[PDB]
From Swiss-Prot, chain A:
Function: Required for invasion of epithelial cells.
Name listed for the protein in its UniProt record: Protein PrgH
Organism listed in the record: Salmonella typhimurium (strain LT2 / SGSC1412 / ATCC 700720)
Subcellular location: Cell membrane
Parent-protein start and end of this portion: 263 to 392 of 392
Entry keywords, A to Z: Cell membrane, Membrane, Transmembrane, Transmembrane helix, Virulence
CC terms in the record's Gene Ontology section: plasma membrane
From Swiss-Prot, chain B:
Family to which this protein belongs: Belongs to the FliP/MopC/SpaP family.
Residues of the signal peptide: none
Protein name (record): Surface presentation of antigens protein SpaP
Domain of life: Bacteria
Length: 130, 75
């Protein structure tokens, strides 16, 4: 999708790569589908039962895996990620893995459009829409 | 003793009597230890309104005319 090149241009590109790699006899250019890439990523996370969120941009997809994770989850995650990366590279899909504690450190709050935090009984904080 | 007309009705009389004692509350407060005054005040709030009522920790304080029964043993 993202490349609009003519066959002649592709041939020229091929020849220049061949000039950069003096040990290679020829370079074969193959066109792949982005939807396929993104799909295999998301299906792999579901196949591993990991919790995640997905975000889409003009030119990339970010899967954010964050929170309190078990040792088993961390192991499975790092194994899968290392496998996928070796196949597609880090140029289109990114994985962000972050350990988080409790979101608000264990204190009561209202999460509406007018949410707020109870610092202590008798103490309101109103920092931001939660 | 002051003979000038000053009160008319129950709320004005109770305020007139209360106002007459501030000359002595100011004395007790001026020599009592702030920490003890705070202890005896909090421990009365937790009797009346229940111990779950927020412990005040008035660490920077204007102690809001504390009750004399709480103020006297601190002195």
């Amino acid at each position: 999708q993202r490349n609009t090149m003519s066959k002649k241009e592709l041939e020229v590109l091929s020849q220049k790569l061949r000039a950069l790699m003096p040990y290679a006899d020829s370079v074969n250019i193959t066109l792949m589908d982005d939807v396929t890439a993104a799909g295999q990523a998301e299906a792999g996370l579901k196949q591993q039962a990991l919790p995640y969120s997905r975000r889409n941009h003009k030119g990339g997809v970010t899967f954010v895996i964050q929170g309190a994770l078990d040792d088993v989850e961390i192991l499975r995650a790092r194994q899968f990620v290392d496998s996928y990366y070796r196949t597609w590279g880090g140029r289109y899909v990114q994985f962000a893995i972050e350990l988080k504690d409790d979101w608000l450190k264990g204190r009561s709050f209202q999460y509406g459009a007018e949410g707020y935090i109870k610092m202590s009984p008798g103490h309101w904080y109103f920092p931001s829409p939660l | 003793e002051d003979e000038d007309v000053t009160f008319n009705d129950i709320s004005s009389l109770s305020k007139h009597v209360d106002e007459g004692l501030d000359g002595y509350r100011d004395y007790l407060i001026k020599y009592s230890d702030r920490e003890l005054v705070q202890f005896f005040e909090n421990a009365q709030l937790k009797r009346q309104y229940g111990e779950e009522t927020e412990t005040v920790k008035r660490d920077k304080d204007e102690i809001e005319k504390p009750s004399i029964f709480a103020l006297l043993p601190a002195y």
